[PDB]
Scaffold this active site. Sequence first.
Site, PDB file in Angstrom:
ATOM      1  CG  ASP A  24     -37.005  44.031  -5.594  1.00  0.00           C
ATOM      2  OD1 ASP A  24     -36.209  44.657  -6.326  1.00  0.00           O
ATOM      3  OD2 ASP A  24     -36.958  44.220  -4.348  1.00  0.00           O
ATOM      4  NE  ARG A  41     -40.612  43.711  -3.021  1.00  0.00           N
ATOM      5  CZ  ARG A  41     -39.997  42.613  -2.641  1.00  0.00           C
ATOM      6  NH1 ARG A  41     -38.666  42.580  -2.563  1.00  0.00           N
ATOM      7  NH2 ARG A  41     -40.738  41.546  -2.338  1.00  0.00           N
ATOM      8  CE1 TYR A  97     -31.901  46.068  -3.213  1.00  0.00           C
ATOM      9  CE2 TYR A  97     -30.337  44.300  -3.559  1.00  0.00           C
ATOM     10  CZ  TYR A  97     -31.506  44.929  -3.898  1.00  0.00           C
ATOM     11  OH  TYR A  97     -32.272  44.424  -4.929  1.00  0.00           O
ATOM     12  N   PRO A 135     -27.018  44.835  -7.954  1.00  0.00           N
ATOM     13  CG  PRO A 135     -27.953  44.040  -5.921  1.00  0.00           C
ATOM     14  CD  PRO A 135     -26.610  44.254  -6.665  1.00  0.00           C
TER      15      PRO A 135
HETATM   16  C1  LIG Z   1     -29.979  33.770  -5.829  1.00  0.00           C
HETATM   17  C2  LIG Z   1     -30.097  35.073  -6.570  1.00  0.00           C
HETATM   18  C3  LIG Z   1     -30.276  36.265  -5.872  1.00  0.00           C
HETATM   19  C4  LIG Z   1     -30.585  37.431  -6.569  1.00  0.00           C
HETATM   20  N1  LIG Z   1     -30.757  38.617  -5.884  1.00  0.00           N
HETATM   21  C5  LIG Z   1     -31.075  39.769  -6.566  1.00  0.00           C
HETATM   22  C6  LIG Z   1     -31.261  40.956  -5.864  1.00  0.00           C
HETATM   23  O1  LIG Z   1     -31.131  41.013  -4.639  1.00  0.00           O
HETATM   24  N2  LIG Z   1     -31.567  42.100  -6.561  1.00  0.00           N
HETATM   25  C7  LIG Z   1     -31.682  42.067  -7.935  1.00  0.00           C
HETATM   26  O2  LIG Z   1     -31.952  43.114  -8.512  1.00  0.00           O
HETATM   27  N3  LIG Z   1     -31.494  40.886  -8.651  1.00  0.00           N
HETATM   28  C8  LIG Z   1     -31.174  39.746  -7.961  1.00  0.00           C
HETATM   29  N4  LIG Z   1     -30.992  38.562  -8.664  1.00  0.00           N
HETATM   30  C9  LIG Z   1     -30.775  38.642 -10.141  1.00  0.00           C
HETATM   31  C10 LIG Z   1     -32.120  38.565 -10.851  1.00  0.00           C
HETATM   32  O3  LIG Z   1     -32.934  37.563 -10.263  1.00  0.00           O
HETATM   33  C11 LIG Z   1     -31.879  38.288 -12.344  1.00  0.00           C
HETATM   34  O4  LIG Z   1     -31.099  39.339 -12.907  1.00  0.00           O
HETATM   35  C12 LIG Z   1     -33.205  38.168 -13.104  1.00  0.00           C
HETATM   36  O5  LIG Z   1     -34.014  37.139 -12.562  1.00  0.00           O
HETATM   37  C13 LIG Z   1     -32.961  37.901 -14.587  1.00  0.00           C
HETATM   38  O6  LIG Z   1     -32.179  36.739 -14.667  1.00  0.00           O
HETATM   39  P1  LIG Z   1     -32.438  35.578 -15.741  1.00  0.00           P
HETATM   40  O7  LIG Z   1     -33.911  35.343 -16.153  1.00  0.00           O
HETATM   41  O8  LIG Z   1     -31.584  35.771 -16.932  1.00  0.00           O
HETATM   42  O9  LIG Z   1     -31.797  34.319 -14.961  1.00  0.00           O
HETATM   43  P2  LIG Z   1     -32.328  33.716 -13.576  1.00  0.00           P
HETATM   44  O10 LIG Z   1     -33.287  34.609 -12.922  1.00  0.00           O
HETATM   45  O11 LIG Z   1     -31.094  33.328 -12.749  1.00  0.00           O
HETATM   46  O12 LIG Z   1     -33.115  32.383 -14.007  1.00  0.00           O
HETATM   47  C14 LIG Z   1     -32.423  31.348 -14.707  1.00  0.00           C
HETATM   48  C15 LIG Z   1     -33.312  30.115 -14.626  1.00  0.00           C
HETATM   49  O13 LIG Z   1     -32.612  29.085 -15.294  1.00  0.00           O
HETATM   50  C16 LIG Z   1     -32.596  27.918 -14.486  1.00  0.00           C
HETATM   51  N5  LIG Z   1     -31.357  27.183 -14.784  1.00  0.00           N
HETATM   52  C17 LIG Z   1     -30.073  27.488 -14.399  1.00  0.00           C
HETATM   53  N6  LIG Z   1     -29.234  26.561 -14.913  1.00  0.00           N
HETATM   54  C18 LIG Z   1     -29.978  25.681 -15.624  1.00  0.00           C
HETATM   55  C19 LIG Z   1     -29.645  24.563 -16.356  1.00  0.00           C
HETATM   56  N7  LIG Z   1     -28.366  24.232 -16.560  1.00  0.00           N
HETATM   57  N8  LIG Z   1     -30.644  23.868 -16.988  1.00  0.00           N
HETATM   58  C20 LIG Z   1     -31.963  24.253 -16.900  1.00  0.00           C
HETATM   59  N9  LIG Z   1     -32.298  25.366 -16.165  1.00  0.00           N
HETATM   60  C21 LIG Z   1     -31.313  26.067 -15.552  1.00  0.00           C
HETATM   61  C22 LIG Z   1     -32.747  28.357 -13.044  1.00  0.00           C
HETATM   62  O14 LIG Z   1     -33.368  27.311 -12.307  1.00  0.00           O
HETATM   63  C23 LIG Z   1     -33.574  29.636 -13.188  1.00  0.00           C
HETATM   64  O15 LIG Z   1     -34.949  29.348 -12.984  1.00  0.00           O
HETATM   65  C24 LIG Z   1     -30.702  37.412  -7.959  1.00  0.00           C
HETATM   66  C25 LIG Z   1     -30.526  36.210  -8.639  1.00  0.00           C
HETATM   67  C26 LIG Z   1     -30.220  35.053  -7.953  1.00  0.00           C
HETATM   68  C27 LIG Z   1     -30.154  33.748  -8.717  1.00  0.00           C
END
Ligand SMILES: Cc1cc2nc3c(=O)[nH]c(=O)nc-3n(C[C@H](O)[C@H](O)[C@H](O)COP(=O)(O)OP(=O)(O)OC[C@H]3O[C@@H](n4cnc5c(N)ncnc54)[C@H](O)[C@@H]3O)c2cc1C
EC number: 1.14.13.7
Lengths: 656, 652
Positions: free
Chosen positions: B54, B281, B289, B354
């Site tokens: 967020d 928010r 948290y 986070p």
């Molecule tokens: C459940 C959870 C809770 C979180 N809580 C917080 C929080 O409280 N505070 C905070 O600051 N950040 C939080 N985050 C972290 C934050 O969301 C991420 O740092 C941010 O979204 C950037 O991550 P990203 O785009 O690299 O990966 P992600 O946001 O994890 O997205 C990865 C995407 O890849 C997809 N994926 C995964 N594996 C595969 C696969 N093998 N094949 C195809 N697609 C796949 C998933 O479906 C997802 O849509 C949380 C993340 C998660 C998953």
Amino acid sequence: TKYSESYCDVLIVGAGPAGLMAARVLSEYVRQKPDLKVRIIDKRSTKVYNGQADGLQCRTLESLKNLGLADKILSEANDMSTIALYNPDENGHIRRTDRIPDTLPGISRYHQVVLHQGRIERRILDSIAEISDTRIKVERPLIPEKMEIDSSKAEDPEAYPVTMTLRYMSEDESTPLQFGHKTENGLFRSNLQTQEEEDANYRLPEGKEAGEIETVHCKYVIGCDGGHSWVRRTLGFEMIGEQTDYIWGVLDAVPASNFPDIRSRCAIHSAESGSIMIIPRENNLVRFYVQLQARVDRTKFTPEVVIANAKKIFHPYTFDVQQLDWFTAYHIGQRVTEKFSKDERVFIAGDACHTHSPKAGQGMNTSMMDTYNLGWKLGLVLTGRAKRDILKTYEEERQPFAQALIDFDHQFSRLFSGRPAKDVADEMGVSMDVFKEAFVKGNEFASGTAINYDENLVTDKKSSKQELAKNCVVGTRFKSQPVVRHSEGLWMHFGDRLVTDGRFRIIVFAGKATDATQMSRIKKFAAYLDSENSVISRYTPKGADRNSRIDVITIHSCHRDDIEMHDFPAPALHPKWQYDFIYADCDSWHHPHPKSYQAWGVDETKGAVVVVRPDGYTSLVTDLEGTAEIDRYFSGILVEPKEKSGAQTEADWTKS
Amino acid sequence: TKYSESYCDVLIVGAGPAGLMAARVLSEYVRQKPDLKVRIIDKRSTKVYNGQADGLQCRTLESLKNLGLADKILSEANDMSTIALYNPDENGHIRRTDRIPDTLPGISRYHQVVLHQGRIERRILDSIAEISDTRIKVERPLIPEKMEIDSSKAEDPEAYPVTMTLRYMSEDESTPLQFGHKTENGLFRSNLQTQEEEDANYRLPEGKEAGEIETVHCKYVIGCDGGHSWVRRTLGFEMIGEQTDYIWGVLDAVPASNFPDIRSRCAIHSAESGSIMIIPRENNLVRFYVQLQATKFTPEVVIANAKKIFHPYTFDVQQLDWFTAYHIGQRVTEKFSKDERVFIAGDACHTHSPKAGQGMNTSMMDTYNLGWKLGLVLTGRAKRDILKTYEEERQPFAQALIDFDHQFSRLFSGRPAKDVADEMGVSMDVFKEAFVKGNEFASGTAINYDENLVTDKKSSKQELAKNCVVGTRFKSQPVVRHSEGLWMHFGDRLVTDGRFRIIVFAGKATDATQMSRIKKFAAYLDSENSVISRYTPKGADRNSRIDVITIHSCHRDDIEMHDFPAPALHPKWQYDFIYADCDSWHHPHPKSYQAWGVDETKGAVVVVRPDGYTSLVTDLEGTAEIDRYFSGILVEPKEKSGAQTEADWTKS
Ligand SMILES: Cc1cc2nc3c(=O)[nH]c(=O)nc-3n(C[C@H](O)[C@H](O)[C@H](O)COP(=O)(O)OP(=O)(O)OC[C@H]3O[C@@H](n4cnc5c(N)ncnc54)[C@H](O)[C@@H]3O)c2cc1C
Ligand SMILES: Cc1cc2nc3c(=O)[nH]c(=O)nc-3n(C[C@H](O)[C@H](O)[C@H](O)COP(=O)(O)OP(=O)(O)OC[C@H]3O[C@@H](n4cnc5c(N)ncnc54)[C@H](O)[C@@H]3O)c2cc1C
Ligand SMILES: [Cl-]
Ligand SMILES: [Cl-]
């Protein structure tokens, strides 16, 4: 022909800026009271562009912000920023003699901007759809053919004193002429069009029968039907003013020119060929108001003719068009009515009440501001929240403004259209010094922010102690100043808090709340608010939130490190689990102390209380002890709900 | 089983913030060269709708603005404004001891704001649709089963060195969101609401069926698949770090509380019950948290811990929109690329707490960096060697992030010291310091990339633009657009679309000696072999590859746009090229030359990368350095623009 019959609370005739603003304002009341029936109709199809304006002024933008419409418009609109003044030198070559600001510094936090009228309307329509939950929709093509008014029923709240007969038109009838020009144009709705031609063009042709004729019984009708208003003429309301022989053309084009200030607003007086006003627009467009040499035959008014004279006026700079989106023509003239209402049952607004030149882009602004004014008054009347007598204030407030607009334009349009004087001995010519002066003065008026409504049922000067808020003059708009929201310390424009939704505000300038004597005054005032017969207790329906009819907001003069929200009376001034009520005039992380009490003219220690109308105009200024004045002000306007909230009975949530 | 086979230029695995940013950035290149095929897949049936990331920090917002996404996000997001610090007094009672700004004054024109991941995903998805003209759509739920990389083909521009085997999933297989999409009330649906609703349905790509196995030959693959990255694991890049025993919960709720600073960002260290961070928010929501004291963690347990930490203030939840739980830990890879053919970005590369909301920020900034480099390579505009700079730039940042978080998360999770000798406790003075210093890092604006192929420190005369340090982001300063005198943030002009910029600080252009230097520089631009003439394709606009922008130090009343070389610096019938550091109607002189550290009289020339980072600083005479900089990066089009031949359009 199908014949039909129905009932409605308000019929808005015309869906241009005035009508759409009326629908947007009324949408809020329909959402609160869903059995309200508000209809809005238009006789024209949408196949030919039915618009012509582009400029939105400061007060209009402040109002649109309070309707949730400003930011979207601002995302697209262009701020012209500067007005460059060009006029002839010795050799009769035009050159730049001065620049003045397009918006006067400090006058508003919004600057004038320009944007295609269709985009502005789209934003308003989207907002109508949202607020009304899609229930208010423009009906087209429909046109009134008869209006009957029963004046004997004017004061009966249950009556439908206005019978409107509406004809459902065919597509062909609703399609405006284009006069053989390939470029889309507004000639059909220019003032070159006569009122007789206006009527004739949309008539049911000889031989054909109408699809449907609907008899609509209405509580209220708002004529927002333009310069040749059928409603105005049917009411018999005369318009005063005469049209001159000055003729101008308009081109919305992407230019190809070496004129140095082509992207700035400009006024150009050429030696002998007329004037130009440049209005730089969004997306590389620029609008050019081009005076022409001189009924005029509309089929003979081509872009080529306009371009030809523009090139003359620009000499020796070049002027060509890379692309032409639209064009139109108009004569310079002014007209205004004395009456805006019959029985406070049929109202007229906008171009129907006032017409004038576009030199200061005033029409759409004024027209929307007319129904922003009428709409909350009618809204409160229709919901049983205010006395019908408030409707008289619409004419009392808006008609004198229309006269002032016409007076302003009468002079400005002529100065803009006259030949520039060659020297001090050129009596017949227009003085360029006078013109600049008129422009600078006009920019204050044109902003829409200098309005001061005379004393009336909703504007209480006599009971006010004006010296307590010297720069919140009763009758003028309540001006935004920066404040710091206490809850998290967000620096923000206080005007953003005055969301227009039917509520009046009591602004409690709590002053130096850390001072024991001052806090005692604040507590006594809150005790009044919580009392059985206060305006909050008697005008808030039982079970309803106590800030849902009169919204009580506190701005204190202390730093948020020195006093807490919970040090204020709760819930009278600090409502339960709500954080948009306490603001501070203090220093903040990213901005210095804004000196906003001072800008508002309020004593920093003692403060004041200021009442603000639902349209954002200040209506009373008093002290914390002035509860009798507050009480009387609201007694003259609002109607007690069947069941009232009565005395505040909740314990202070900040302990509990 | 149905089998299929296809080819593509880039496959993005994962459609979270990292992946979506990658697709958004690559969208521009696809629009320019529609033969390009960029795919993006996700194993989850729908986008996120609530919670998760967020936080949007300063540099991220600056970058989003340059993608046309900031204003829409800001229309909804919340600026937390203040960080209130609470800790126990002698008697163990929590009290506010200080307040610090949530964004450091002056660090950026954007302040940090917060808004949940579902809204961010919505906005980036919509921008992808607009820019790509729907030529790029997220395909879901699809999942990779196998990846084969032929390293012998790494440098062959015509090869597809990476073979990905993908499986189309049934609705039942995709693990849904606990807090998914909710139908709006009433009849009305805005376009945004309609798109949200449509996106909430399980729908494979047209013509595909659950169970189908597709062999996809790829030129490039970007693993944006999150903390447990299948791509990273398949590549064998070890996630280096450790996981503590600290466990925290998160609640996105509309609170009912008498805590005085409930709507402010806060850090609360309780005497003996753990810590809380409050993140206020949008729309009356507040994220909490909440550290948990020690099988299946629920909101109820998190609320119970929160009540203990808030004591004696009250805390109840009126409405709950999302919740999760996590351990405090840090991990980062040493490598971000295999053969500069398969890349990883985002959580796939770095995980952490986070406490400073760094996840979505860093992850989107990773693909904002990789995306332009890859886009220029795929469009035949840049040399493949530029791809090496992604790891060179982003991996050290990830390590710095992990180091920052390692300390900060532990200070946040420790018991506050009861006195000066309470060594087993955390000093609140140390915590405040770490928070203040952390806010600079967390803003994302302090990055300084080491010298590399696209970052030329050696050839620069840094003293000519002292506050435009090569390797750092080119900081916006207010300027006055010359054409109409509009005061504006200059950063708004640096729209991210694959172009490099040459910023010509023209200095005191009314001075004859200075104008002579400006003219000589424009003569270079117009010359047959200048970077403009050499890297602009024949027939193309001469600002469409390298965008040459002039900022002078004169008042607009004193010189005209047409006094500048045209069309070299003042292009034909175009008005977004000449800006002034001068006084204006509604603002004082912004002293922007001074803020940028450029001499007001003599000026400077500053090259800026497509991602808005300064890459070279020189003088108007430094054309040789400019040539050499671009020669190492760009590829000449087969037919070049050549010397500028058009006559000065301003002279009739
Ligand atoms: C459940 C959870 C809770 C979180 N809580 C917080 C929080 O409280 N505070 C905070 O600051 N950040 C939080 N985050 C972290 C934050 O969301 C991420 O740092 C941010 O979204 C950037 O991550 P990203 O785009 O690299 O990966 P992600 O946001 O994890 O997205 C990865 C995407 O890849 C997809 N994926 C995964 N594996 C595969 C696969 N093998 N094949 C195809 N697609 C796949 C998933 O479906 C997802 O849509 C949380 C993340 C998660 C998953
Ligand atoms: C060239 C030009 C440029 C201008 N530029 C600006 C500017 O920049 N800024 C500004 O503020 N103002 C500007 N104006 C003025 C502005 O256009 C008008 O003042 C404004 O549009 C009037 O709004 P309105 O809603 O009252 O009437 P209108 O805009 O005329 O709308 C009337 C609506 O009612 C419909 N209607 C008419 N008769 C009937 C009927 N009998 N039954 C059903 N429907 C009917 C019409 O079809 C139309 O849709 C400009 C005007 C011109 C001439
Ligand atoms: Cl708004
Ligand atoms: Cl934006």
